[PDB]
Amino acid sequence: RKVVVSALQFACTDDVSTNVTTAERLVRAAHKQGANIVLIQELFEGYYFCQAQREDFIQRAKPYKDHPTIMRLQKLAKELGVVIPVSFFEEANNAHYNSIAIIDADGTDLGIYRKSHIPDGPGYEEKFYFNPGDTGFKVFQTKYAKIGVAICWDQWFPEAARAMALQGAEILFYPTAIGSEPHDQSIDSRDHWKRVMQGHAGANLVPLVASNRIGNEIIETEHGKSEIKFYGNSFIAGPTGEIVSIADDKEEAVLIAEFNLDKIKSMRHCWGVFRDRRPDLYKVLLTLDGKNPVL
Amino acid sequence: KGRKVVVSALQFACTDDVSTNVTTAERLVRAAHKQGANIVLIQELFEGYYFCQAQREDFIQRAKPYKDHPTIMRLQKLAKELGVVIPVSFFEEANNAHYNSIAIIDADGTDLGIYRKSHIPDGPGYEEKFYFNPGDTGFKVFQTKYAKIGVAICWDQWFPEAARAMALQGAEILFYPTAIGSEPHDQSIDSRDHWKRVMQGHAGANLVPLVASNRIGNEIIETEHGKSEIKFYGNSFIAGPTGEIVSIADDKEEAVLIAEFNLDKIKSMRHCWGVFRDRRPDLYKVLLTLDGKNPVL
Amino acid sequence: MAEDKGRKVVVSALQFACTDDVSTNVTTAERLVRAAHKQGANIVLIQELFEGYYFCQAQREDFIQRAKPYKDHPTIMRLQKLAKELGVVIPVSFFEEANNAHYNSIAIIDADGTDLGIYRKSHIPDGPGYEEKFYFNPGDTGFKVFQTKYAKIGVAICWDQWFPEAARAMALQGAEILFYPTAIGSEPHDQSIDSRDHWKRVMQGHAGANLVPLVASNRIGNEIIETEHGKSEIKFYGNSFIAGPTGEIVSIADDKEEAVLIAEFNLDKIKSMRHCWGVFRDRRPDLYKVLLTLDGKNPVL
Amino acid sequence: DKGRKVVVSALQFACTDDVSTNVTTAERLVRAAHKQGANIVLIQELFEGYYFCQAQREDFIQRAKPYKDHPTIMRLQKLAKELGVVIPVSFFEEANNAHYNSIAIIDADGTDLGIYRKSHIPDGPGYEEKFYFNPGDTGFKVFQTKYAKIGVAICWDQWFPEAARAMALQGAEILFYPTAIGSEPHDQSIDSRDHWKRVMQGHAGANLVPLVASNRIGNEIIETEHGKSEIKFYGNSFIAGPTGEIVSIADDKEEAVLIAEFNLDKIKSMRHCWGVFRDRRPDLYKVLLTLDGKNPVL
Amino acid sequence: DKGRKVVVSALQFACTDDVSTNVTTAERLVRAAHKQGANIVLIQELFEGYYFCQAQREDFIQRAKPYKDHPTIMRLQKLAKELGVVIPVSFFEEANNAHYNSIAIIDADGTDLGIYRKSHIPDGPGYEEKFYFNPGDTGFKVFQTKYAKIGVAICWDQWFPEAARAMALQGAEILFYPTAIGSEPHDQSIDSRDHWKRVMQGHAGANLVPLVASNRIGNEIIETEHGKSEIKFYGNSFIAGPTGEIVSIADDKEEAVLIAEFNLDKIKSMRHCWGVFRDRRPDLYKVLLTLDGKNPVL
Amino acid sequence: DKGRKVVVSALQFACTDDVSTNVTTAERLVRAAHKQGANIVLIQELFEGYYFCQAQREDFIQRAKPYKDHPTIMRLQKLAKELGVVIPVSFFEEANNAHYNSIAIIDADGTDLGIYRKSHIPDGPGYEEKFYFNPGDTGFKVFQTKYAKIGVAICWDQWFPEAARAMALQGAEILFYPTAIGSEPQSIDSRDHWKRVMQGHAGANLVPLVASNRIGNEIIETEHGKSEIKFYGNSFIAGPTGEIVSIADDKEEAVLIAEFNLDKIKSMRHCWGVFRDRRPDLYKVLLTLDGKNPVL
Ligand SMILES: *C(O)(O)NCCCCN
Ligand SMILES: *C(O)(O)NCCCCN
Ligand SMILES: *C(O)(O)NCCCCN
Ligand SMILES: *C(O)(O)NCCCCN
Ligand SMILES: *C(O)(O)NCCCCN
């Protein structure tokens, strides 16, 4: 059993219809190169608006139900027979989430995951927009594979990757929007970013796909212009954490890698780390401060 | 710029003759409509006297089924004629169950369904617990032609949980038909300021406007222990999304209160303030207890 | 002076002996229904499986084939004519065949002759003399109420009368009077068993707890059935009765006479009393999930 | 006649409005029961004072006390232990801002086995309990005592076949109901005593378990917010057997100590053979989780 | 060839009227099966005593015992753990006032994995089980053991294609049915043994899963409420492969230990290839939720 | 010996790839069954030609014909009326965009009582039938004939206990299964597996069961060249305990005959008690494919 996976990497305008056209073009290119599952970067419908903390930007969110972009990519998924996770800004009554809908290769909406770990600070004021997610970590049975899909900042947390692996994830996927930080040009996070994820692939023995944005974006914030340069470096890592495919920090790209899932599942079983785990000794992971279990 | 809705609170006196009272309600709904109202709110159990001063066998038989209710049917025609949303408070019989209920009539005349009062008051003057099963619909929101609304009934208005329950389900405006006044056993009790402050609190905590329609007049009821009298204190009002009173009636005048709200701007304001973003349902399990320790079954 | 307002309904319990010939027993039933109507009855209740002997003392292959379809049943059709002629409601107990299922059933015939539908016995008894579990699928209609020309009524069958759940289910759905056609007597394996006082008390409790009148019609006479292991005899103990909404017996027959019991109820006064007593206002269904278990712990599927 | 035997007792007495006097009365009659061989002794509802629920008064709510270190429960634990008798203790419970009509079950070694909180709360003239008590949130309970597994509910609960069935399904071998019922002050023509008995006899017969009801006697005048209100409590404390037969009964004015012995092994065998529990149809009982016969409650 | 192999066994013996004797007989035959390589061993229905259901007797109901701390289950857990063998244990369960014909599945490490309660209850002369057992309320279950996911149901359940299909759908790799079937005391012309085998062979073949049936032998006479009643149990315990072929079978009168090995990975692959499960039409099977071919049950 | 008696027959023959010839063969064998007293006679599946269904050829699709005015059905109606026999007629149905593997039930007076459309269609490696047939949408049916209430299902339907139970719950007194099964002239021989599953249905439902299978070798040229199947016959009739009462071999024409007392069998079915004892409250999992999620 072999599945072909793709990371896409492109620049966005602040127009939904242009960006969706761009995603469609790169999804067809992926499909043309053999892709069964194609990963589109985080909040690709527009500019990464979380540089600002603005009332009007919250109203960019849309219900999960009858979402125009999801609906449009469901047609594309269906035509091509590819699996397409769709990053979007969800409104759910008065709650708001950074969410992702998993469309199967028959175009079926398989359900959503809501971003669990919400980043904060200059350039990435996501805590202002999003309730911390309440779906918990999830795995989706698609026509090709059980996949673990989480979102951007979730990729820094070994807990997220481990939870998806424990629930049957054969591949992990992280749509991303990370770049420079507007308050401090000396912060270059790209190597650190890659290393943490490489760690998750190696610790769980599962391949991993990260799709990140490129281009410079200037946002009109409540305190004036703020600029981020997104550094791309979209990549696909194998089950021991080796980078098999990688983009640069400036050019549009379509990454492709094939994995033998039944072989990798045998290596995983045979390595035996899941049977060697000591959940009896991991209670402290349910604390924040190293002592008090959360309610 | 944005969806506007004009809401109205009515305030009037009742006899114990249904036809008279429905006629009074119609006159005032028409008057609200003439002043631009899209949703009009009539006070609790308006079809007669506030009979719950007594605990009487014969008064339980004032209840009628929800199905083919002559007062709901009559007000459905008016709703349709005028293009206004009309919540209709009534005493519901449902086989051997009885409830203090409200049917939400949409602006096309459609009966959108019912809510059954959840929190039932008790004590001299207000012996509701004798008459009504505690409601079993739970808190509801209704999609009307003009807005998603949350409607609850009188005593429900004291409970922050009801208001929050409706808001979490997308209610854009909260409505509470009311019957509250003096208390026949103790003339020193004057609850009007307390009553208003608690509702203002709900409007401000959920960032939604709130409408409260209360009775006026003195009513004398024969009870098992002789006459009992309540002076209903009016003070019907409409509050905006920070809990500010935008319109209020006094304690004796018949009144038609009118207010317009921009539901898109308020939505935007509600979200921006951030309370719904910041709620901690993981820490709210104690709210599912009565005694602060034991969760109910 | 005017008498007190409200819908009055006159109900009747019949009590008679059966042969094992269908034509004879239907003739007996018609005779007693007519006598009940002559005494003012609006609703008349015939005992369980009146078409024949209480054959359930045996577990026999050939007795299963006494069952007949509900559709075009000759006894139901005949009693429909009588109901229409007299203007009386008549529930008709019969052994139902429904493809390969079999039930102990009752068809409710309205005062205009209309077949309102059926109830299938839910609780099926077992044991020497009363081997009903061999014959009947447990019923699958659930507890029902029927709107007749005179009243909304709840009808269940024999062993159902021991279950408070059945009486409450019918009352919660607006039953104004409860009816139980019965066949109960001695038990052939042990002559010390005399259940008649126990039997009455349980049903009196239903009437009192739901504040609705209750009618029980039971068989009389001795019947001997040829069983797979020899002859078996039951003496049916009569004691048909009508109870009011506090569980008081307003009329009762003895253990051997043929009887036509008659009582009038003001259903509007009773409804008022039922509601004022307050039990239905005070019920706690949030605490009753355990009733959906058999063993006090595990909810059934 | 082999089998585990248990002797139960219903007590019936008049109350003053002084706790000390009523607790002394209860102790006297518990000792009289024990002298007659009783293993489990049932004291009537809210026996610490007058039946105060004729009134709806602010100050009466403050008669409530916490379950923890309750002076009357602690005193009766001493007696339970001294005599080797099981004693359910009815009390008015405060639990932060909630209030309940409650009963603590004291085992024959003095151990406090836990509480049941009254589920069905009556209302109306003379019996304004809904003003005082949150509807109970323990659900129906059974308690394993030294002598038997028992089901204890409280007064108005005794009208509900659901409560009796719920306790029996959980293995209750005997049902107990402390009571306060009498005349009704707004209508002198109401005499509920025969109705009250018939409904409980029904529960005993339907579940094939014995049942004990202890009820108050005497006239009580309460100063209500609208003037004097009077109830004459009608006694009629009784013990019913597993077919609903009254085996012992008190009249409507006498102080009484009723006594009956039950063979719990034989009764268990009878209950099972009669077959009602074998034949129940919980798949058809979902309408019991409605109030109106149609909508399941949340 | 390659893949997870499992050795299963059907045991067949005659019962005495003494519980401990009968458990010792079971232990002896379990040990003999283990010696021949068995991983999962099936003991016949209600093996602790005579098949008492010929009678409808009050005292026989009290032969039931709770699942909790059941002395026969506890004893067989020790054997399971000692030998590393999976052992389903048939017993007569008391659960407050409910009673069931039940089976506890003991894993090869001695762990009590839970119980299944007999769903379909037979009736008629000689087999009056409806008098004793509530219809089961666990539903059909599959248990994950150290060696396989197994589906265990009980005697009469074996006539119902629905039970076997329910277990296969939930992952059962082997079906097991402890049995007590023989002659019928009211009609000596009834010989059901060929019919009995054919129906089970049909389940194995329709689901492509092996099937194990363990039945009693011996003549048993029971004192019924109407005199002596005799059943001659007919043995014919057997093991069927995934196309329904009988691979091992006992006769109608001797003790037997039957043994068969199955390659569960090859059978699984063969079942997936055959594709019947992906070809099923559940959208057309709603009539199966009726008894009468028309009205769905509640 | 009292009660309604019905004589049923299973026919078995080799198909040529010529329609007239095959219908002539069917008529000859129906007449022979009638001569031996048969009241209801079962002809094997798709008997008008070679079993084309696993060859995936677009030109074979035009063999389908509408249910309305079907020349083979209309001809067998005449035969049914002439002889006073019930004849289920297997045919390849064209229904607008859809195509089905279907069977029309002809009563003893020649009346067309209706159609059943094969429900279970094998898809995945080895079985490419979807190329020709849509999954049936009639659901499982019973038909009241002059002699009996009967249930009929087709070929692959044979493997599914649900179809047999569904028919019996609705009052079918006899089950009929026209089939076509064989193998590559391979090691696996499915004939015993097949019989055991069917004997299971008869025994579990306490109804007799009639199965008609073809014989002979058939060669079809396909996209992937010549495919050959040897059909293994073994048509049979089973009684209500699953006992085989007559059976054909794997190479000759056969006319199998058996008489059933439908009143006695009904009484036996009811007394055995399985239908009294069924637990539909516990069967919801059967409305899933994966053992957890109900289908729409
Ligand atoms: C996505 O937007 O969560 N990446 C967050 C990066 C935060 C860097 N300080
Ligand atoms: C409406 O009737 O619920 N108002 C109740 C007020 C109670 C005052 N103590
Ligand atoms: C009717 O037939 O159900 N009465 C059942 C009585 C059973 C007595 N043990
Ligand atoms: C106890 O106190 O609940 N008694 C209730 C009686 C109410 C009479 N209508
Ligand atoms: C086990 O006891 O279920 N076998 C029942 C057989 C009944 C025979 N008619």
Numbering used by the authors:
A (entry chain G): 7 to 301
B (entry chain E): 5 to 301
C (entry chain C): 1 to 301
D (entry chain D), E (entry chain B): 4 to 301
F (entry chain A): 4 to 188, 191 to 301
List passages from the publication reporting this PDB structure.
The structures of wild-type MtCPA, crystallized in the presence of PUT and CAD in the solution, were determined at 1.97 and 2.19 Å resolution, respectively. Inspection of the electron density maps, representing the structure of MtCPA cocrystallized with PUT, brought unexpected, but very informative results. The DHMP covalent adduct is stabilized by placement of one of its oxygen atoms within the oxyanion hole, created by Nζ of Lys121 and the backbone N of Trp159 (see Active Site and the Reaction Mechanism). Subsequently, the amino group of the intermediate accepts a proton, donated by Glu48, and leaves as the first by-product, ammonia, resulting in the planar S-acyl intermediate-enzyme complex, which is hydrated to yield the tetrahedral oxyanionic geminal diol (present in the crystal structure of MtCPA/DHMP complex).
The arginine route involves three enzymatic steps: (i) arginine decarboxylation to agmatine by arginine decarboxylase (ADC, EC 4.1.1.19); (ii) deimination of agmatine by agmatine iminohydrolase (AIH, EC 3.5.3.12) and (iii) hydrolysis of N-carbamoylputrescine (NCP) to putrescine by N-carbamoylputrescine amidohydrolase (CPA, EC 3.5.1.53), with the release of carbon dioxide and ammonia. N-carbamoylputrescine amidohydrolase enzymes belong to nitrilases, and more precisely, to C-N hydrolases breaking non-peptide bonds using Cys-Glu-Lys catalytic triad.
